[PDB]
Write a protein that binds this ligand. Structure first.
Ligand SMILES: Cc1cccc2c(-c3cc(C(F)(F)F)ccc3F)nn(Cc3nnn(C)n3)c12
Lengths: 97, 417
């Protein structure tokens, strides 16, 4: 909500990178329906993953009951934390990491 | 005494002779307005009429009547001088081509261009003129009645002479009169003096309504001027009076009038909760076969244009639902009075009788119109509202402080719920 208000104070930018004040349109109906298009596309792809291929994004080892005595061959985060964890692996010092 | 007279040639002399008329007028009309022009020759009908109307008059007042559909010269004189006025216009027409051939149009073109520019300066005339065009874009009916500047300077005597020879013909011309005079004497006077070439009535160029929006945002003006209208019933349509009745339901409004706080139309009370609009005017403009029904409005606040369009269009919805009998009774009475008001001046009835005789071929006196309007029930208005208003395409125009006028889809969507 705070992000939305910080947006609303000055409004949203545009691809051209110039003032939108020359030509503004109400969010409804135009951009409401654009939001519906993107929402249905997102939900369709989300359905693909959820129903037809749910575990591809996840890691199989997470279905093994965890026990501290056994270390898996590769301790790795889910895909979308990888870019940051890579940095953590690259920096020698733990504090520096 | 609405009686008609057909001369030896096909010219019809229609005269609304009536005792107790303050002054009398006679006018010759030929059905060639901006409708019968094209962009290259736009304004020629107005220019050729002004040249004829600029001719010296024997104490009579020659004035030019210019309109989308019909165009002619009108002479106004005291009741005793009507026959001289009648013989005058016949002299003008018989010598029309000769007058135009030698006439120098430069001064007349300057006057016409000044007229056209003055129309653009006045916001209401600009908005209405743009509104009519936007509805009929692509057809000749979109052309301004007086034309535009850049069009006018290209006019030449050949353009008008071609125009007159095409249109100023017996079958495409009518003679109108009104006042306290004997009909027969005027008819005989015209026959002995009017000599015009024969010709077939030029087919009226078709036009079709196209819902659209024309915005001329002008931030320097003090007020926002907007007009919104639909494809209203035009002349020779059985709903012609019905469209006028529907318009009178919402009527007129002016915020700084002593009647503002006390007027009947619902929209008037609604807009005063915030002084949304300074003035608005509902109208039913009717052409030969097409009409535009809507309102014009001037808004003196930048931040209330959307509020007005929302509320005004919401009020239109009530034509098809929850329209009250009292409103219809009010609108019927208001239209009847307004209809009779237009026909008071002998000049106005002369223009009116010429319009009907050209564009519909017959005319209804106030007696017939009152019999028709009196028979309009609430159901007839509601059926019309659904036919011509409910979810029907609108046409939008606006010039000043338009920034707050929300785009088409918003206003158009308000036409249905
Ligand atoms: C399984 C695993 C191994 C190594 C690191 C991580 C992280 C991780 C967490 C953070 C933060 F401090 F933000 F918590 C920052 C960087 C990281 F690499 N997380 N995980 C499990 C996981 N990965 N992705 N998800 C949805 N959970 C790891």
């Amino acid at each position: 909500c705070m992000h939305l208000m910080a947006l609303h104070v000055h409004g949203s930018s545009n691809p051209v990178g110039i003032t939108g004040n020359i030509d503004r349109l109400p969010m409804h109906p135009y951009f409401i329906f654009k939001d519906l298009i993107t929402v249905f596309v997102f939900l369709l792809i989300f359905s693909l993953f959820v129903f037809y291929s749910p575990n591809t994004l996840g890691h199989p080892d997470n279905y093994i009951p965890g026990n501290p005595m056994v270390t898996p061959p590769s301790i790795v985060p889910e895909w979308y934390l990888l870019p940051f964890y890579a940095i953590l692996r690259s920096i020698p010092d733990k504090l520096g990491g | 005494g609405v009686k008609y007279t057909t001369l030896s040639n096909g010219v019809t002399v229609a005269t609304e002779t009536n005792p107790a008329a303050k002054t009398s007028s006679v006018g010759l009309f030929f059905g060639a307005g901006s409708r019968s022009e094209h962009s290259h020759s736009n304004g020629i009908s107005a220019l050729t009429t002004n040249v004829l109307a600029s001719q010296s008059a024997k104490g009579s007042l020659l004035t030019a009547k210019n309109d989308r559909e019909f165009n002619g010269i009108i002479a106004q004189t005291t009741n005793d001088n009507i026959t001289e006025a009648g013989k005058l216009i016949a002299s003008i027409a018989s010598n029309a081509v000769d007058i135009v051939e030698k006439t120098d149009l430069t001064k007349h073109k300057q006057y016409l261009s000044a007229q056209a520019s003055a129309v653009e300066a006045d916001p209401k005339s600009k908005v209405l003129s743009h509104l009519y065009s936007s509805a009929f874009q692509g057809y000749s009916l979109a052309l301004p009645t007086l034309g535009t500047t850049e069009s006018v300077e290209n006019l030449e005597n050949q353009d008008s002479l071609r125009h007159l020879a095409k249109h100023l013909v017996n079958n495409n011309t009518v003679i109108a009169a009104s006042g306290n005079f004997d009909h027969d004497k005027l008819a005989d006077a015209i026959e002995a003096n009017l000599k015009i070439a024969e010709g077939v009535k030029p087919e009226i160029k078709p036009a079709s309504f196209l819902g659209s929006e024309v915005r001329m945002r002008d931030d320097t003006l003090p007020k926002a001027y907007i007009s919104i209208a639909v494809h209203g019933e035009g002349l020779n349509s059985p709903n012609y009076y019905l469209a006028k009745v529907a318009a009178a339901i919402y009527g007129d409004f002016y915020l700084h009038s002593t009647i503002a706080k006390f007027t009947s139309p619902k929209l008037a009370s609604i807009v005063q909760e915030y002084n949304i609009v300074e003035s608005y005017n509902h109208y039913s403009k009717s052409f030969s076969d097409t009409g535009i029904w809507g309102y014009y409005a001037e808004i003196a606040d930048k931040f209330t244009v959307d509020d007005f369009t929302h509320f005004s269009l919401k009020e239109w919805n009530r034509l098809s639902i929850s329209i009250s009998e009292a409103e219809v009774a009010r609108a019927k009475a208001q239209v009847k009075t307004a209809l009779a008001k237009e026909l008071a001046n002998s000049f106005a009835v002369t223009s009116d009788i010429a319009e009907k005789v050209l564009l519909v071929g017959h005319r209804q006196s106030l007696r017939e119109a009152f019999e028709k309007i009196d028979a309009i029930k609430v159901n007839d208005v509601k059926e019309w509202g659904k036919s011509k208003v409910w979810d029907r395409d609108i046409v939008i125009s606006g010039t000043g402080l338009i920034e707050d006028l929300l785009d088409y889809n918003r206003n158009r969507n308000e036409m249905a719920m």
